[PDB]
XYZ file of N, CA, C and O in Angstrom:
340
model
N -51.608 11.566 44.972
C -52.815 11.901 45.772
C -54.005 12.207 44.868
O -53.922 12.077 43.647
N -55.114 12.608 45.479
C -56.328 12.930 44.737
C -57.230 13.831 45.570
O -57.138 13.842 46.794
N -58.107 14.581 44.909
C -59.018 15.466 45.622
C -60.447 15.307 45.108
O -60.667 14.953 43.950
N -61.408 15.576 45.979
C -62.818 15.473 45.623
C -63.584 16.682 46.140
O -63.684 16.893 47.348
N -64.122 17.478 45.222
C -64.867 18.669 45.598
C -66.352 18.485 45.334
O -66.769 18.291 44.194
N -67.151 18.558 46.393
C -68.594 18.409 46.252
C -69.338 19.478 47.044
O -68.733 20.246 47.792
N -70.656 19.517 46.872
C -71.494 20.489 47.567
C -72.301 19.822 48.676
O -73.064 18.890 48.427
N -72.138 20.314 49.901
C -72.862 19.769 51.043
C -73.878 20.781 51.566
O -73.543 21.665 52.354
N -75.121 20.632 51.119
C -76.212 21.517 51.523
C -77.558 20.865 51.225
O -78.503 20.976 52.005
N -77.623 20.189 50.079
C -78.833 19.501 49.628
C -79.604 18.875 50.787
O -79.035 18.574 51.836
N -80.904 18.663 50.582
C -81.751 18.054 51.605
C -81.703 16.530 51.509
O -82.537 15.829 52.082
N -80.709 16.036 50.785
C -80.506 14.612 50.593
C -79.070 14.377 50.133
O -78.827 13.864 49.041
N -78.095 14.785 50.965
C -76.672 14.656 50.655
C -76.313 13.320 50.011
O -77.119 12.391 49.977
N -75.088 13.240 49.500
C -74.601 12.031 48.847
C -74.683 10.826 49.780
O -74.808 9.690 49.326
N -74.607 11.079 51.083
C -74.674 10.000 52.051
C -73.530 9.016 51.898
O -73.679 7.977 51.256
N -72.385 9.345 52.484
C -71.211 8.482 52.404
C -70.610 8.236 53.785
O -70.835 9.006 54.717
N -69.846 7.156 53.906
C -69.211 6.806 55.171
C -67.842 6.174 54.932
O -67.577 5.638 53.857
N -66.976 6.240 55.941
C -65.638 5.673 55.832
C -65.256 4.909 57.094
O -65.698 5.237 58.194
N -64.424 3.888 56.919
C -63.965 3.067 58.031
C -62.450 2.902 57.979
O -61.873 2.728 56.907
N -61.807 2.967 59.139
C -60.358 2.827 59.209
C -59.949 1.822 60.281
O -60.701 1.553 61.216
N -58.749 1.271 60.136
C -58.231 0.294 61.088
C -58.009 0.939 62.459
O -58.594 1.976 62.765
N -57.175 0.314 63.286
C -56.894 0.830 64.624
C -55.923 2.015 64.596
O -55.496 2.494 65.646
N -55.573 2.488 63.400
C -54.653 3.615 63.268
C -55.374 4.876 62.794
O -54.732 5.875 62.465
N -56.703 4.830 62.751
C -57.491 5.976 62.307
C -57.005 6.470 60.947
O -56.788 7.665 60.744
N -56.824 5.531 60.023
C -56.345 5.844 58.679
C -57.470 6.291 57.745
O -57.279 6.364 56.532
N -58.627 6.591 58.320
C -59.798 7.037 57.555
C -59.833 6.447 56.145
O -59.413 7.094 55.187
N -60.350 5.228 56.019
C -60.445 4.583 54.718
C -61.897 4.538 54.260
O -62.741 3.923 54.909
N -62.176 5.194 53.136
C -63.524 5.233 52.575
C -64.219 3.878 52.724
O -63.577 2.833 52.631
N -65.522 3.901 52.992
C -66.274 2.668 53.193
C -67.425 2.509 52.205
O -67.364 1.679 51.299
N -68.489 3.280 52.403
C -69.661 3.186 51.537
C -70.025 4.530 50.913
O -69.556 5.581 51.344
N -70.877 4.470 49.892
C -71.332 5.662 49.187
C -72.742 5.449 48.642
O -72.932 4.756 47.642
N -73.726 6.047 49.303
C -75.119 5.922 48.883
C -75.279 6.301 47.411
O -74.677 7.266 46.939
N -76.091 5.532 46.692
C -76.329 5.782 45.274
C -76.837 7.202 45.044
O -77.636 7.720 45.822
N -76.365 7.825 43.968
C -76.784 9.178 43.653
C -76.161 10.208 44.574
O -75.432 9.862 45.503
N -76.450 11.480 44.318
C -75.907 12.545 45.140
C -74.786 13.298 44.450
O -75.021 14.321 43.806
N -73.565 12.792 44.586
C -72.403 13.423 43.972
C -71.191 12.498 44.012
O -70.436 12.410 43.043
N -71.009 11.806 45.134
C -69.886 10.889 45.286
C -70.035 9.696 44.351
O -69.242 9.517 43.427
N -71.063 8.886 44.589
C -71.325 7.714 43.761
C -71.328 8.089 42.281
O -70.999 7.273 41.421
N -71.702 9.332 41.995
C -71.749 9.825 40.624
C -70.389 10.371 40.194
O -70.076 10.413 39.004
N -69.587 10.790 41.170
C -68.260 11.335 40.895
C -67.468 10.419 39.965
O -66.932 10.862 38.951
N -67.399 9.139 40.320
C -66.670 8.184 39.507
C -65.204 8.097 39.886
O -64.681 7.007 40.118
N -64.543 9.247 39.951
C -63.130 9.297 40.307
C -62.891 8.712 41.697
O -61.773 8.324 42.032
N -63.949 8.651 42.503
C -63.847 8.113 43.854
C -63.517 6.623 43.822
O -63.823 5.929 42.853
N -62.889 6.141 44.890
C -62.517 4.736 44.984
C -62.647 4.233 46.417
O -61.806 4.525 47.268
N -63.707 3.474 46.678
C -63.951 2.923 48.007
C -62.738 2.158 48.519
O -62.037 1.496 47.754
N -62.496 2.258 49.820
C -61.367 1.577 50.419
C -60.113 2.429 50.435
O -59.150 2.110 51.133
N -60.122 3.517 49.670
C -58.973 4.413 49.611
C -58.911 5.282 50.860
O -59.938 5.741 51.360
N -57.704 5.497 51.367
C -57.516 6.304 52.565
C -57.504 7.794 52.237
O -57.074 8.204 51.159
N -57.972 8.594 53.186
C -58.016 10.041 53.028
C -57.107 10.706 54.062
O -57.218 10.441 55.259
N -56.191 11.547 53.592
C -55.241 12.220 54.473
C -55.825 13.479 55.108
O -55.540 13.784 56.266
N -56.628 14.213 54.351
C -57.227 15.438 54.853
C -58.310 15.941 53.916
O -58.164 15.904 52.693
N -59.392 16.414 54.504
C -60.519 16.939 53.736
C -60.783 18.404 54.059
O -60.570 18.858 55.179
N -61.253 19.133 53.058
C -61.558 20.555 53.207
C -60.473 21.288 54.000
O -60.756 22.266 54.692
N -59.237 20.810 53.897
C -58.139 21.440 54.613
C -58.088 21.035 56.075
O -57.635 21.804 56.923
N -58.556 19.827 56.370
C -58.566 19.318 57.737
C -57.720 18.054 57.849
O -57.989 17.054 57.182
N -56.704 18.104 58.705
C -55.828 16.961 58.915
C -56.609 15.806 59.530
O -56.584 15.603 60.743
N -57.309 15.059 58.684
C -58.106 13.931 59.136
C -57.234 12.757 59.567
O -57.738 11.754 60.072
N -55.929 12.883 59.361
C -54.999 11.825 59.724
C -54.623 11.894 61.205
O -53.466 11.681 61.568
N -55.603 12.190 62.058
C -55.365 12.283 63.495
C -56.670 12.151 64.275
O -56.771 11.350 65.204
N -57.666 12.945 63.895
C -58.965 12.923 64.563
C -59.780 11.707 64.137
O -59.550 11.137 63.071
N -60.742 11.323 64.972
C -61.599 10.184 64.671
C -62.470 10.485 63.464
O -62.721 11.647 63.145
N -62.933 9.439 62.792
C -63.770 9.613 61.617
C -65.042 10.387 61.944
O -65.491 11.208 61.148
N -65.614 10.138 63.117
C -66.827 10.838 63.527
C -66.565 12.336 63.596
O -67.442 13.146 63.294
N -65.345 12.694 63.975
C -64.958 14.093 64.064
C -64.927 14.716 62.675
O -65.366 15.848 62.483
N -64.408 13.962 61.708
C -64.323 14.438 60.332
C -65.698 14.483 59.683
O -66.061 15.478 59.060
N -66.464 13.402 59.838
C -67.806 13.334 59.271
C -68.542 14.631 59.570
O -69.079 15.284 58.673
N -68.518 15.023 60.838
C -69.139 16.268 61.248
C -68.289 17.436 60.755
O -68.810 18.498 60.418
N -66.970 17.219 60.694
C -66.048 18.243 60.213
C -66.401 18.640 58.786
O -66.205 19.784 58.376
N -66.941 17.683 58.040
C -67.347 17.925 56.667
C -68.622 18.753 56.672
O -68.727 19.767 55.983
N -69.579 18.320 57.489
C -70.843 19.031 57.629
C -70.600 20.402 58.250
O -71.396 21.326 58.086
N -69.481 20.519 58.964
C -69.097 21.762 59.618
C -69.117 22.931 58.636
O -69.867 23.892 58.811
N -68.283 22.840 57.606
C -68.195 23.887 56.593
C -69.500 24.004 55.812
O -70.317 23.084 55.805
N -69.689 25.151 55.160
C -70.895 25.411 54.373
C -71.315 24.189 53.558
O -72.439 23.704 53.691
N -70.412 23.692 52.717
C -70.727 22.532 51.904
C -69.585 22.110 50.998
O -69.344 20.919 50.812
N -68.888 23.084 50.424
C -67.774 22.795 49.529
C -66.634 22.110 50.276
O -65.910 22.746 51.041
N -66.477 20.805 50.051
C -65.420 20.044 50.708
C -64.450 19.445 49.702
O -64.849 18.987 48.631
N -63.177 19.441 50.077
C -62.111 18.892 49.244
C -61.386 17.782 49.996
O -60.549 18.050 50.855
N -61.722 16.537 49.683
C -61.112 15.395 50.352
C -59.888 14.899 49.607
O -59.942 14.623 48.412
N -58.788 14.767 50.339
C -57.543 14.281 49.765
C -57.468 12.767 49.907
O -57.378 12.243 51.017
N -57.525 12.066 48.781
C -57.484 10.610 48.789
C -56.287 10.083 48.013
O -55.708 10.788 47.186
N -55.924 8.835 48.280
C -54.799 8.204 47.605
C -55.286 7.131 46.630
O -56.248 6.417 46.910
N -54.622 7.007 45.467
C -54.986 6.019 44.448
C -55.085 4.609 45.018
O -54.301 4.220 45.882
N -56.058 3.846 44.528
C -56.264 2.477 44.988
C -55.333 1.513 44.259
O -55.779 0.676 43.475
N -54.037 1.634 44.526
C -53.044 0.772 43.897
C -52.082 0.205 44.936
O -50.890 0.042 44.672
N -52.607 -0.096 46.119
C -51.796 -0.645 47.200
C -51.325 -2.056 46.864
O -52.184 -2.905 46.545
């Protein structure tokens, strides 16, 4: 597995999005240049996320998580899997 810790408060967040199949497998999609994600490096687009900031994202819709991320103050920890499928 893998984790990603970033700060969500800035007036111009990293701006990222994820897309999943019909199984709501929350698979990373895009990452706006700059911010923290695109700069993170360790991140890998297309990789699935099991849970972020301690949230079982492996059940709720991505829209629920997207806001679920914005929900907390800012410090989020996304659990991702290596891109070696």
